Structures are given as structure tokens and as C-alpha cells.
Write a protein that binds this DNA or RNA. Structure first.
Ligand SMILES: [Zn+2]
Ligand SMILES: [Zn+2]
Lengths: 183, 928, 73, 182
RNA sequence: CCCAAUGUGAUUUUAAUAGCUUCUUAGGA
RNA sequence: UCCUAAGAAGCUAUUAAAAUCACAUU
């Protein structure tokens, strides 16, 4: 705000020494310029302190609000991140167990790695069974498994010869299949 | 032809069935260990023995046995002397049978001595084989173990069957030598009584005793008036000492009538004072030792008497019941209600100690007395449940709760925005030289007690005391630079007050609460109690959540506020003096920045001649450290207290370290366990006590290198005189020779130049001396650690360098380059590139995964990455530019989000300096 | 870059299992921790993808703990 | 005061700058004004110093008044802990060992062994169970103990009928057994 | 639940140090 | 009237200390 006084004082001082005006007038101008410069610096120091103080407050509000937004959403973010990364791997065994799990064909155990180890899987309907079971065999996690028993939802044992289109309304779905790894 | 007439005369009157063990009339040649001191040589070394013929017995069914007749040639004046001495000791049952005869060779009569039914090897061969150990030169140790039924010859086909850490069954195979070594200690005390009563003077050495315990050489003894004989035993016992605990020799003292076929002694359960048992054990095995033994170290005269008497206490404390040690408690009345409180401590090393300021009746408690009675384990353990924990071999005291606690560790958080950026710049392609190796590993509920059970590697270890008492005076020469002493509570500095106070104090607040609540006169009044009384204290174990390249759990020990507050007021003036010094051996407190790495390496290179570099490793360092070396470290740090403390104040302070950070109770999962030894991480002195231990083991290796070199083959007359004086300063002088302690320090500091920081070290050394045997090498550290640290040091974790323009291969996990910087060349440190990429990808909190909050984090990791820009591999040089390019992206995104949120720009544009190299290069140029 | 992507997917998958309170079943958490730590130490991708199929089968067996039919769109 | 002297000198100078035409009187007005203004800025600077020092004194007094609260608060929690633990000691069993001691003093490690009413056993596997606890009573520390409960690593109760060589794969080891002194 | 010591980077406050302007006072001309 | 010597007030820069925070070594 005192700049106008500083700008007019320095122009009048430089004009006076350029024209060669009397030294007492040039001193009155130079001394006016010194106090006008001092008032301009005194105004500038106030705005620079208020601008420094606002820049801190704006920054602390950003950090506080965005830190709380990161912390509150963590469960939904992690599950969305996981099912994004599994698409980029594009491994057939991971795709095969995920595409079965969409349709409700899920394991009761952790899937085993060693030969002749036990697996148990839920089968929701004959229309799912037809895509994964074939004769004495079962296909899951991009490997071959051999079936050893099957049960109704009431735990009654079912023979593999009973599971057919016409008879399928008489079975108590969902079925549970028990199988072993083939090698 | 003639040799059959000699063989029949060697049999003589005796029933024997001898066979020749070499050519019949000439002497045999064998390589054997000797303890030797002449006018012309001294040491404990291997030599050729060439004066003796040998014959071996068959039994009554045509098989050879461990019984030899050893025959030798004499000068006639020495033959008459050795016969004259033998006929005085002839009645002693500890003396091997001799026959003296003359026989014809080369046309003339020659005098012979025959020594009957000796073993193949001597007590010196057993001691020299377990010291001086090489896993590719075990043939004498294997043959001793197999001859005396310790194991079958098939045992040595195991992978690393000697590694105490990988094959802990070797402690059972070696303990089968124990009763054979104890019977040799008993026969020596019979032989000393025979020499004294007969009036005979001489020196006992390990090479004159067989492995049945019989004594057989007298050619250097002299007569005196009967009843005034003098056996000298200073090398015999001291050189043997580390084998007595390794072979568990006194294990028979635990049985009725000390017979290994009878049951164990059942002691009175309330008994804590074993002072008369300790004095009786000393008179049985060490009768002629000729120095005063104090069972309780509160009676000792100085630091060197404490180290002497504590070494017999680590031996004898193996006989007594494990429940007898620890805090001693008494019943006292406060306002008419009965408390149980600790009024003393029983130590395996220091003996029995009592508190001087016990009050049996009190009307009120001060704030100072509430800290002492809350820190003391007595009230916690007396009011807890009995515990039988089958998951550990360590001793369990009490369960403080009705339930056990199981502590897991969770995985790290993944910073996907940095990983997707690094993959776009071509990082992590298959077959690249830079890949992820550092991760946050998860842990299950079993991990805390599974890490605690690794204290099973701490074993009772007895030192060679004549070697240790010399080594301590050369270790103290490395600490002449500094000042130390006690300070008042108003002079103490604390780095961070918002950290845990330990147990039980963490129920009520952080360390800030106790420094605010205690006035300086409460703090100075607690420090004065610890100079007259012992405070035992509890320590918590916590699992650590931090990035690593290895999947084993890590734990940290939280030491209590009473221990932390008063140890800081005893030691801090010295620790601040070690950190403020430059150009010293111990480099704690020196930075790598502003030219500091170059100044450190120019200092260790010193003025060494024919220089190579090496560095070495300590297996299981914090778990395996002996109590005799953790007591030696605090006795060295206390040598600064000569003006401010009496001998009594210095003892009661040591007892307070031993009760709080060496042998103390441990809170692990809501239960109390007894810690056997080793360093606790929260001890204020840990980096400084490690540095004293690291120097001690390196001075020890150089004494063993010089004393086990054949002194006739050393070409330089200066180093012969240094070897000859070193043997006297260990095994024949008994006061400190200050002029030789200065001369051996001046030798060592020129030819073997060290740079030391906690458990990490570099040495620059004279490679001509190290290959002649005149200074230590990597095989001397392997031998020392094997018998001293009781751990096998694999050479696969050691290193050496021939070219000083490459620098040390690693110090403090950082490699070195010599690079041009301005007009001249300098050494710069650089990290593993996978540690710096790992810290960008994986983080310990969810809010660290938005970079706009965290630009200070990436600037700090770019300061450590900068030196990689000068490396010859472009895949390493690209790691710095990745960090600078990501810092620009974060400021551009921060600037966009700030404008979208508030419609107004930030005024601090000065962030522009952090994506340009000039800010980072200035961290590695000198003159700040 | 499939080896680094398998190791980064292991860290995110155990973080999802930990938020589903699997630490509340000590015999199940002790198996998830071992499958995770093995995938991080692996050197051939054909081992690491077999252990990823066992570790993911924990999350698929927890019926109703994730809305997989919505996450898989 | 100095301010009123400054304000009255400002008006006395300003009316002469406005209408006054004599620099002589302006120089006398200027010197007396600059003296009054100097005394005013000096009084204001001394006042401002004493005010900033008074806020330092009041915040120091509040820090002390809040530190004497925390000393008294933690003192009450330490006395509540110590005087509670006196209720857990069975003083009849403790008096018997302390009166049998030669000098009234005993090791701490023998106090739970000889006086505790209750035992916890933590067992890693079925071979260790069979070798130590099999049945309903067992002997340890030269006393007889009777099992009141067993729980697993999830803190679920286990019935003694479940612990066997055949079923042991189905249990969350380690088991914790709680027993009472017979 | 979350130890000890050392080093480095960033921001804020406070003290001292220098120059810079004006005011007041005194010596010399 | 000018030069000069001292004090005060304000302005600017620098250095030091303290607090807060990130990173690194053991
Ligand atoms: Zn002594
Ligand atoms: Zn002192």
C-alpha cells in the first residue's frame, strides 16, 4: 500500500538528480524516498507473514483430510486391488478356480499340492456338474482328480450312475464331491 | 639281527608282549605339542620329537592295545640325575613305572631309560587339539575320541558334526572325556604332595602327563630339604582351564559319594549359601594354585581379583541346583501388612550379595520406594501361578495371568503407485541384475517363544585366566583417549521421552511420566541406593515389524526405567566422549557424509607395510557371548571411576548390571523366564560393550598366533624377543609389566590396524607377517571362537582383499568405490539396490501409500541412492534417476490436487531443488 | 515380469486374509503365513504359482466373507 | 502518558504542517514530537516484553500444576497394585517355608514351587501330553495335582476325551492344562 | 504390545551476530 | 550547516539452540 509513495518518491528523486536541482531539495527527495521505502518494506513484511501463515494452514488441512480418507477406505481398497492384480497374472489355474467360484463351485479344504491328497468341493447343480465331472474324474485348478464319494445335502451317499438330467430333480442339491489328485 | 636282543631287554622282568613301532635300533620321529620355555625359545607349539624308540603291546589274543613302552638315549650325567630323582618319588601311585639300563650299540655301552605302559597321546595333545582347531586337520582329535569310546568312527561322516549350533550332540560326545580329565586333575594333586614331602622343586607341564593321568619326566627337577618341595603349576592349570567346562569334567560332583553309578544328591530346597562347598571344591582339584580365592566377590581387592575369583565360580556353580540362584527374598512390614521383597542376590559368577539398607518395619512409602518395590520381581513372582512350559529348555518361574498370550506379525503394505511407475521405466524384467529381495515377512503365534529358546546356545565357559588378565591390560590401552565419571540428574541428556518404560511401568505411562514425576533429588537419591543395594528388574521381549532379506523372527528387549535411569547417570559421560572423538579405533559417532567415509578408510590404512584387508563374522553373537566376557566389558568401562567411587561402590554397581541386563527374569507372553546370559538390546551400553568384546577377541587371536609359532624359525631377532617376553607376561609374571603392555600395544597397532563399530570390524594388516604366523589371520579367529565363543565360524561369511584401491568388501552393509570428485579421487559408500527399491515398494502403515503426503520420505531415500550414479553397471545407476523422476511426479500431482481442493496455488515453489542432482552431490563433498 | 507380480500379489492376498480375521484361527493363520513366506523366497515361477493356488483357495472357501461376484466385474 | 504526549504533539505539529507557514516553530514541534514518540515506542516495547514474559510464566505454572497431578495419580495406581497383590498370597503356606529358613531368607525361585495353589502346563504335542499328564491327576514339583480344565491355542475348551493319538491332528496345539494342588 | 545408541534430511520457534533507515544526544570545524 | 561518536526503534541476512518430522547404520 505504501508502494505508491515509494514509486513516486524514486521517480522524483531520479528526475531531480537528472535535472540538477538544488541539493537541499534533492536531500528532501532522497530522505522522503528512504522513509517511503521503509514504509513499503514494513507493509511487505506484514503480507509475507500472513501469506506464510495461510500456506501452512491450507497444507495441514489437506494432510488431515486426505490421511483420514486413506485410513477409512482400506478394506474396500485392498479387495479391489487384489482382484485387479489377479487379472494381470492371467494364469489358467487361478482363472479356473475364480471362474468356478463366481458360480458357487467352491472348495471346503485348502487345495493340496502332493499326489493322492484329499480335496472336497461343493457342486450347486447338474448344469455346473456337466462342465467339471467326467466319468470317474473331476477337473479343477487346471489338474485331474479322481472321485471317491459324493453326497446329498442331507449327507446321504449318491452313486455316480444316479447323476443324470431326468433324475436330477430327485437329488438334494447342493452335492459335495470328495476326490484325490491323479498322477 | 641285533634288535631282538634289545626288544627282550625292553620287556625285562615284566610280563609283556611288545612289537616294534618303527626301525628296531634307531629312534622314531613324531610330531607332538609342547609347553616350552628355555633361554632360546618359548611357546605352546608343535615340534618334531626324535630321541625315543617306541614299542606297542599285543594282548593275550593277538590284538594291539593303547599301551606303549617308550625308550630313549641319555648323556650319563643326566641318566644318574633322573634315576636319583625317580627313586624318591617311586612310592607315588601317580608316577609311571621306569626301568634304567645299559646296552651295547656301535661297539660301546650306552645308557637307556624305558618308560612303561604310556598312552599314544599326552594331556598337551588333548588341550592343543581343542584350542587351535581346524576342521580339515582333525586327525589327533578324531583318534582321541575313537580310542576312548566317545563315539564310533562313523560319527565323522555327518555334515558339520562339530558345529555346536548345527550339531548340538557334539556336547554329549565331548562330555564323554570328562571323567578321564577329572581323574587326571586328581593324580596331579597326589604328585604335588609327593614332590613337597620328598623335598623336590620343579615345573609341571601338560606334555609330561599321559591320558591315563600318570607323570613321567624328571630331567629338570632339583633336590631341597624334605617337606620343603615346590611344584610350579601356573601354565599347567591355566592352559587346561577352557577344556574343564567344554568336557563337563566336574559332573561327577553332583552324585552321592561322587560315583557316576549312584543317584544325584538331593539338596535342602531352602539353601542358598554354598560358600563351604566352593572352598572344599577348590582344595580338592586346585590345592597348589598359590593365589587367594574368594568364593564371594564382595571380598575382592580390585578388578583383577574379581576376574580371577569369578572364573572359579563359573566352574563350581555347575554342581549346585538351578533353583538356588537369583533374587533372595525376606518378609517385611509396611503399615502393619506383610510384603515380600528382595534383600540380596545369588550370582553364578559373583557369589552371595546382601543389601546394606534393609528396613524390616516402615510406616509410609516414598515415591522412590514405590518404584523399587514395583520394579522388583519378588511381589510379581510370589503372587503368580506355577508354570511348566514344555516348549523350551530354559527355566520358567511363574505365569502372571490365567491365560497365555500368542503374538503374530502381519505382512507389509504394498505401495502400488511406485511399483507401476518403476515397471514403466523397465525395472524388474526377468534376468535383470536388480530384483526384489527385501520384504516384510509375516509370523504365527509360536514365533516369540521360538526366538526366546535360542538362548540354549549360551553355555557356562571358563577362561584361561593368565591369558585373560594380560589381554585386559592391552584392551584398556584402546580406551586411554577418553574421560568418564558420575554426573548429577540435572546433567543427563535423554533422546526421546515418548518411548516405553518397561514392566510394570508401561501400565501407567511412557518414560516422560517418570522424568516429570521424579525431581532431581529423587533421581540422585535412587542412584545412591544402587551403590549400596541390588535392584533386580524385569525385561519385556517384543517382536519387531521391519523389512529384511531373511524370514526368521527378530525380537527387542525393553529394559525397565529403574535400570535405564541409573545406568545412564553412571556411564553417559564416557559414552558421549567415545562418540565425540575422531581418528580412534572405535568409530561410533562418526558419519559417512561430507567426506567422513574417506577419512575413516585413510585412518585404518594408517602406515601398515605390505597391507591386505580383512573382515570377519560372529555367529549367534548376542545369544552366545560368555558371562566372563560381558563382566570383563563393564569392568573396563568402570576404570574411569577412580576419583568419584570407592572399591565398594564399584562392586555394588557391577552387581546391578549383572542383576538387570546379564542374568535377569524375562517377560515373554505373560510369563516369567530366567535368562542365562548374553546382551539385552535395551541396555544403554550395548554398542560400547560390544566394541570392547570385539577388541578382546582380536587381541586374543594375536597372542595365540605369536605363542604357537615355532620360535626357532622366526628370522627377526626383535620378534623372537617379543615372543619370549609375551610368554613370561602371561605364565610367569603376576603383576602388570607396564613397559611390555606399551610395547605389545605399539607392535599390534602398527602391524594389525583396526576400525571397529559394535559387532562389525575391518582390519588392515601386514600380509608378510600374517603368512609367517607373527600376527592373526582368518584361521586364528576360527580357532578362538570355536573354544572361546563356543561357535564354529565358517569362512564363507569372512572376506579378504589384496587391492586397497577397491576398499573393504563390506562395512555397515555398504560397499565402496574409489571415484573422481573434482580434481582428486575419494572413497564413497553405496547400498544394496534391492534394499532401496524394497523401501519404496513396501511400507509399515497404510497412509505411507499416498506419496503426496510423503515427499520427505523419497528425498531421504534419494540421499542414500546417490552414489550408485558413479557405478559401472547402468542398471544400478538408473536407481537414483527413478527416485528423482518420482519426486517430480509427486509434486505435480500434489499441485493439481491442492488447486482442485482450494482453487488457490501453494506459495512454496522451492521444492524444485529436490529433483536435481546438485542437492544430493553436496552430501558427499568435504567442508560441508 | 511375472515373478515380481506373483510376489507382490502374495503380499496383497495375505493382507486381505488378515483383515478377514484369519488370525482368530491359529491353525489356519499358521498355514497362510507359511504359503506367503515360501512365495517370497521362491526362485522358479512354477513353484510360486502352485503356492498361490493353495493360498487363494483359503479366501474362496470363506463363503460370504467377500462379494466375489461383484469384485470379479 | 507518553502516548497522550505523542498524540497531542502529533496534533500540534500537524496543524502547523496544515496551515502553519513557519519552519522555525515546525523544528521545535518536530524535536518535541520525536522525543514524545520515542518515549511512547520505548514504553510500548517495554510493555510488550513484560507481556510476552508473563505468558511464559503462566504457561510454566500450568506445566508444573499439571505435573504434580500426574505424580499423585500414578502414586495411587502403584499403591493399588502393591496392596492388591498382598491378597493373593496364602500366608499360612508362606509362613511355613520362611520360618523353616535358617536366617529368615529364601531364594525367589522356590516360592511358586512350594506355595502356589494352581499350576499351568503348556504342551506342544501329543507325545509330550502322554509322557506328562495322561489321566486326571499327575505329580510335579513333589506334589499331587488335579486337572480342572484344558484349553487350546484359540482359548476354546478341550474335553479330556478328545485328546488321543487318533484325533490329535484336529486340535490347535499347544494345549494349556490348568490344575489345582491336591 | 511397540528397546538402546549414532548419523542425516525437512519445517517451526527463540537467542546472538552483521548491514540497512530513522530518531535522540555529544565533540570538531 | 556539515563531519563525527553513542544509545534506541525498525528492517534484512546469517549463525546457534530448542521443538516437530522423515530416512540410514549397529
Ligand atoms: Zn578375589
Ligand atoms: Zn563414579
Amino acid at each position: 500500500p505504501s508502494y505508491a509513495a515509494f514509486a513516486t518518491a524514486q521517480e522524483a528523486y531520479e528526475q531531480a538528480v537528472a535535472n540538477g536541482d538544488s541539493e537541499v531539495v534533492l536531500k528532501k527527495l532522497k530522505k522522503s524516498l528512504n522513509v517511503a521505502k521503509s514504509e513499503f518494506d514494513r507493509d511487505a513484511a506484514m503480507q509475507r507473514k500472513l501469506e506464510k501463515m495461510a500456506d501452512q494452514a491450507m497444507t495441514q488441512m489437506y494432510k488431515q483430510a486426505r490421511s483420514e480418507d486413506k485410513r477409512a477406505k482400506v478394506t474396500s481398497a485392498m479387495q479391489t486391488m487384489l482382484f485387479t492384480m489377479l487379472r494381470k497374472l492371467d494364469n489358467d489355474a487361478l482363472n479356473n478356480i475364480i471362474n468356478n467360484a463366481r458360480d458357487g463351485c467352491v472348495p471346503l479344504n485348502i487345495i493340496p499340492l502332493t499326489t493322492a491328497a484329499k480335496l472336497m468341493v461343493v457342486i450347486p447343480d447338474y448344469n455346473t456338474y456337466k462342465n467339471t465331472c467326467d466319468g470317474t474324474t473331476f477337473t479343477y485348478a487346471s489338474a485331474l482328480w479322481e472321485i471317491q464319494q459324493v453326497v446329498d445335502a442331507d449327507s446321504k451317499i449318491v452313486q455316480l450312475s444316479e447323476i443324470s438330467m431326468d433324475n436330477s430333480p430327485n437329488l438334494a442339491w447342493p452335492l459335495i464331491v470328495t476326490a484325490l489328485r491323479a498322477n | 639281527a641285533d634288535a631282538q636282543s634289545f626288544l627282550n631287554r625292553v620287556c625285562g622282568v615284566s610280563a609283556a608282549r611288545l612289537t616294534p613301532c618303527g626301525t628296531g635300533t634307531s629312534t622314531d620321529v613324531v610330531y607332538r605339542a609342547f609347553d616350552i620355555y628355555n633361554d632360546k625359545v618359548a611357546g605352546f607349539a608343535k615340534f618334531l620329537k626324535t630321541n625315543c624308540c617306541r614299542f606297542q603291546e599285543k594282548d593275550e589274543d593277538d590284538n594291539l592295545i593303547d599301551s606303549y613302552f617308550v625308550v630313549k638315549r641319555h648323556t650319563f650325567s643326566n641318566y644318574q640325575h633322573e634315576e636319583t630323582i625317580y627313586n624318591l618319588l617311586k612310592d607315588c601311585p601317580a608316577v609311571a613305572k621306569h626301568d634304567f639300563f645299559k646296552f651295547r650299540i656301535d661297539g660301546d655301552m650306552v645308557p637307556h631309560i624305558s618308560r612303561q605302559r604310556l598312552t599314544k597321546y599326552t594331556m598337551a595333545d588333548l588341550v592343543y587339539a581343542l584350542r587351535h582347531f581346524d576342521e580339515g586337520n582333525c586327525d589327533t582329535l578324531k583318534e582321541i575320541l575313537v580310542t576312548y569310546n566317545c563315539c564310533d568312527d562313523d560319527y565323522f561322516n555327518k555334515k558339520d558334526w562339530y558345529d555346536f549350533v548345527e550339531n548340538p550332540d557334539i556336547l554329549r560326545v565331548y562330555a564323554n572325556l570328562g571323567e578321564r580329565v577329572r581323574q587326571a586333575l586328581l593324580k596331579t594333586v597326589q604328585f604335588c604332595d609327593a614332590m613337597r614331602n620328598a623335598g623336590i622343586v620343579g615345573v609341571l607341564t601338560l606334555d609330561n602327563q599321559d591320558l591315563n593321568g600318570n607323570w613321567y619326566d624328571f630331567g629338570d627337577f632339583i633336590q631341597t630339604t624334605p617337606g620343603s618341595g615346590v611344584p610350579v603349576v601356573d601354565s599347567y592349570y591355566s592352559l587346561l582351564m577352557p577344556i574343564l567346562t567344554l568336557t563337563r569334567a566336574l559332573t561327577a560332583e553332583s552324585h552321592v559319594d561322587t560315583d557316576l553309578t549312584k543317584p544325584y544328591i538331593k539338596w535342602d530346597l531352602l539353601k542358598y549359601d554354598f560358600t563351604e562347598e566352593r572352598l572344599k571344591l577348590f582344595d580338592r582339584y586346585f590345592k597348589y594354585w598359590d593365589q587367594t580365592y574368594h568364593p564371594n566377590c564382595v571380598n575382592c581387592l580390585d578388578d583383577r581379583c574379581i576376574l580371577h575369583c569369578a572364573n572359579f565360580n563359573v566352574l563350581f556353580s555347575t554342581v549346585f541346583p538351578p533353583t538356588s540362584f537369583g533374587p533372595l527374598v525376606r518378609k517385611i512390614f509396611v503399615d502393619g501388612v506383610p510384603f515380600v521383597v528382595s534383600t540380596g542376590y545369588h550370582f553364578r559368577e559373583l557369589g552371595v550379595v546382601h543389601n546394606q539398607d534393609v528396613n524390616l518395619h516402615s510406616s509410609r512409602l516414598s515415591f522412590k520406594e514405590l518404584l523399587v518395590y514395583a520394579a522388583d520381581p519378588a511381589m510379581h513372582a510370589a503372587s503368580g501361578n506355577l508354570l511348566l512350559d514344555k516348549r523350551t529348555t530354559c527355566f520358567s518361574v511363574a505365569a502372571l495371568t490365567n491365560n497365555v498370550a500368542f503374538q503374530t506379525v502381519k505382512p507389509g503394505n504394498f505401495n502400488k503407485d511406485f511399483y507401476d511407475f518403476a515397471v514403466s521405466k523397465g525395472f524388474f524384467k526377468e534376468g535383470s541384475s536388480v530384483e526384489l529381495k527385501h520384504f516384510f515377512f509375516a509370523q504365527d503365534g509360536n514365533a516369540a517363544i521360538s526366538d526366546y529358546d535360542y538362548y540354549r546356545y549360551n553355555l557356562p565357559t571358563m577362561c584361561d585366566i593368565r591369558q585373560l588378565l594380560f589381554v585386559v591390560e592391552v584392551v584398556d590401552k584402546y580406551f586411554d583417549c577418553y574421560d568418564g565419571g558420575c554426573i548429577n540428574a540435572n546433567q543427563v541428556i535423554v533422546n526421546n521421552l515418548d518411548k516405553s518404560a518397561g514392566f510394570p511401568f508401561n501400565k501407567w505411562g511412557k518414560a516422560r511420566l517418570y522424568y516429570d514425576s521424579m525431581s532431581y533429588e529423587d533421581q540422585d537419591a535412587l542412584f545412591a541406593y544402587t551403590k549400596r543395594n541390588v535392584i533386580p528388574t524385569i525385561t519385556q521381549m517384543n517382536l519387531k515389524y521391519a523389512i529384511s532379506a531373511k524370514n526368521r523372527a527378530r525380537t527387542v528387549a525393553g529394559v525397565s526405567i529403574c535400570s535405564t535411569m541409573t545406568n545412564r547417570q553412571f556411564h553417559q559421560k564416557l559414552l558421549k566422549s567415545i562418540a565425540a572423538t575422531r581418528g580412534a579405533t572405535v568409530v561410533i559417532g562418526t558419519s559417512k557424509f561430507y567426506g567422513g567415509w574417506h577419512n575413516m578408510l585413510k585412518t585404518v590404512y594408517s602406515d601398515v607395510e605390505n597391507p591386505h584387508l580383512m573382515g570377519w563374522d560372529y555367529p549367534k553373537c548376542d545369544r552366545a557371548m560368555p558371562n566372563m566376557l560381558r563382566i570383563m566389558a563393564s569392568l573396563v568401562l568402570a576404570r574411569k571411576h577412580t576419583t568419584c567411587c570407592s572399591l565398594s561402590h564399584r562392586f555394588y554397581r557391577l552387581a546391578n548390571e549383572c542383576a538387570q541386563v546379564l542374568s535377569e527374569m524375562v517377560m515373554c507372553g505373560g510369563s516369567l523366564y530366567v535368562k542365562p546370559g548374553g546382551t539385552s538390546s535395551g541396555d544403554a551400553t550395548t554398542a560400547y560393550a560390544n566394541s570392547v568384546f570385539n577388541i578382546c577377541q582380536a587381541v586374543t587371536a594375536n597372542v595365540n598366533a605369536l605363542l604357537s609359532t615355532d620360535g626357532n624359525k622366526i628370522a627377526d631377532k626383535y620378534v623372537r624377543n617379543l615372543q619370549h617376553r609375551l610368554y613370561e607376561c602371561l605364565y610367569r609374571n603376576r603383576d602388570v609389566d607396564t613397559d611390555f603392555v606399551n610395547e605389545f600395544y605399539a607392535y599390534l597397532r602398527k602391524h594389525f590396524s583396526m576400525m571397529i563399530l559394535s559387532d562389525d570390524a575391518v582390519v588392515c594388516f601386514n600380509s608378510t607377517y600374517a603368512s609367517q604366523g607373527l600376527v592373526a589371520s582368518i584361521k586364528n579367529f576360527k580357532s578362538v571362537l570355536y573354544y572361546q565363543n563356543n561357535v564354529f565360524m565358517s569362512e564363507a561369511k569372512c572376506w579378504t582383499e589384496t587391492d586397497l584401491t577397491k576398499g573393504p568388501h563390506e562395512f555397515c552393509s555398504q560397499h565402496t568405490m574409489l571415484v573422481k570428485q573434482g580434481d582428486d579421487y575419494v572413497y564413497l559408500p553405496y547400498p544394496d539396490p534391492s534394499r532401496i527399491l524394497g523401501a519404496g515398494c513396501f511400507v509399515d502403515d497404510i497412509v505411507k501409500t499416498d506419496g503426496t503426503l510423503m515427499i520427505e520420505r523419497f528425498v531421504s531415500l534419494a540421499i542414500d541412492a546417490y552414489p550408485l550414479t558413479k557405478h559401472p553397471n547402468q542398471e544400478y545407476a538408473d536407481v537414483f534417476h527413478l527416485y528423482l523422476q518420482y519426486i517430480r511426479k509427486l509434486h505435480d500431482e500434489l499441485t493439481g490436487h491442492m488447486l482442485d481442493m482450494y482453487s488457490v496455488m501453494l506459495t512454496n515453489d522451492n521444492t524444485s531443488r529436490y529433483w536435481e542432482p546438485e542437492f544430493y552431490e553436496a552430501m558427499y563433498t568435504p567442508h560441508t | 515380469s511375472k515373478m515380481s507380480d506373483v510376489k507382490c500379489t502374495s503380499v496383497v492376498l495375505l493382507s486381505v486374509l488378515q483383515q478377514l480375521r484369519v488370525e482368530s484361527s491359529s491353525k489356519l493363520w499358521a498355514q497362510c503365513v507359511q504359503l506367503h513366506n515360501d512365495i517370497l523366497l521362491a526362485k522358479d515361477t512354477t513353484e510360486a504359482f502352485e503356492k498361490m493356488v493353495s493360498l487363494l483357495s483359503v479366501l474362496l472357501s470363506m463363503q460370504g466373507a467377500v462379494d466375489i461376484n461383484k469384485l470379479c466385474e
